[PDB]
Design a protein around this ligand. Structure first.
Ligand SMILES: *[C@@H]1O[C@H](CO)[C@@H](O[C@@H]2O[C@H](CO)[C@@H](O[C@@H]3O[C@H](CO)[C@@H](O)[C@H](O)[C@@H]3O)[C@H](O)[C@H]2NC(C)=O)[C@H](O)[C@H]1NC(C)=O
Ligand SMILES: *[C@@H]1O[C@H](CO)[C@@H](O[C@@H]2O[C@H](CO)[C@@H](O)[C@H](O)[C@H]2NC(C)=O)[C@H](O)[C@H]1NC(C)=O
Lengths: 172, 55
């Protein structure tokens, strides 16, 4: 979309992430695993919720509606009755087809933002100890265990502890 | 044209009487008198032309 993470710099999507909408996949000294990031999978679902809910309540309740089908030819009063309704109809149909088209474009772009948002949340945590490869993947520049991967994902990473370890791997 | 034996017709009219107004019927032939009045509520009631069974 606009932000160009999804269907963009992130090649494609994980058909085998089944506990969330956004997340991480590691390869470290201890092996290979994956986790959903919840906070973001919530805020993306929480707007769509509101949005849907907003689109819905709304139901035309009035008032002794005029006759709409006709069993004679009557010329003018009828000719108007039909054209009043015929016209109304075309309006709502447009009114509708715009809404869905609008909403979606946005639903699509907000879900895109949420990804790029989670990309930049990570980047800032790993202050100096990694570098963006551009396929939505970092290359951390130190040794990091399952306990350190899971420490990144739950907000509690400590750039300074693996700082010195990080810079030697990058530059020398 | 012939319909149920007859080729005569009746033509049906209405008249609303407001509260405080007065009806006065006057004729010298061919009247189909009313017998009284229907009450006139007014609210969300209406009619539809269906053929689907009520359930
Ligand atoms: C003026 O002419 C009209 C016809 O153009 C006459 O109306 C016709 O009246 C005759 C005589 O009663 C009707 O015959 C009937 O036929 C039905 C058929 O189903 C039958 O049930 C009866 O046994 C009866 O014989 C006929 O229906 C009717 N024609 C039309 C087209 O409505 C009328 O009588 C004439 N009036 C005068 C004052 O001359
Ligand atoms: C978030 O998850 C981390 C990563 O596993 C948790 O790490 C524990 O943290 C304490 C010190 O804060 C240590 O005793 C252990 O290294 C970890 N324990 C276990 C069982 O893994 C931690 O619970 C969470 N972070 C914070 C700051 O509470």
């Amino acid at each position: 979309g606009l932000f160009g993470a999804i269907a963009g710099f992130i090649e494609n999507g994980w058909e085998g992430m089944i506990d969330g909408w956004y997340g991480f996949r590691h390869q470290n000294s201890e092996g290979t695993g994956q986790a959903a990031d919840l906070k973001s999978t919530q805020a993306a679902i929480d707007q769509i919720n509101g949005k849907l809910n907003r689109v819905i309540e709304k139901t035309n309740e009035k008032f002794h509606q005029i006759e709409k089908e006709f069993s004679e030819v009557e010329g003018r009063i009828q000719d108007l009755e039909k054209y009043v309704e015929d016209t109304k109809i075309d309006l709502w149909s447009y009114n509708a087809e715009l809404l869905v088209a609008l909403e979606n474009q946005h639903t699509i772009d907000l879900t895109d933002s949420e990804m790029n948002k989670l990309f930049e949340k990570t980047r800032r945590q790993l202050r100096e100890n990694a570098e963006e490869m551009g396929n939505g993947c970092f290359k951390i520049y130190h040794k990091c265990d399952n306990a350190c991967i899971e420490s990144i994902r739950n907000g509690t990473y400590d750039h300074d502890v693996y700082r010195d370890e990080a810079l030697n791997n990058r530059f020398q | 044209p012939w319909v149920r034996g007859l080729s005569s017709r009746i033509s049906i009219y209405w008249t609303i009487v407001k509260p405080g107004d007065v009806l006065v019927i006057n004729s010298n032939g061919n009247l189909i008198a009313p017998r009284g009045y229907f009450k006139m509520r007014t609210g969300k009631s209406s009619i539809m032309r269906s053929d689907a069974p009520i359930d």
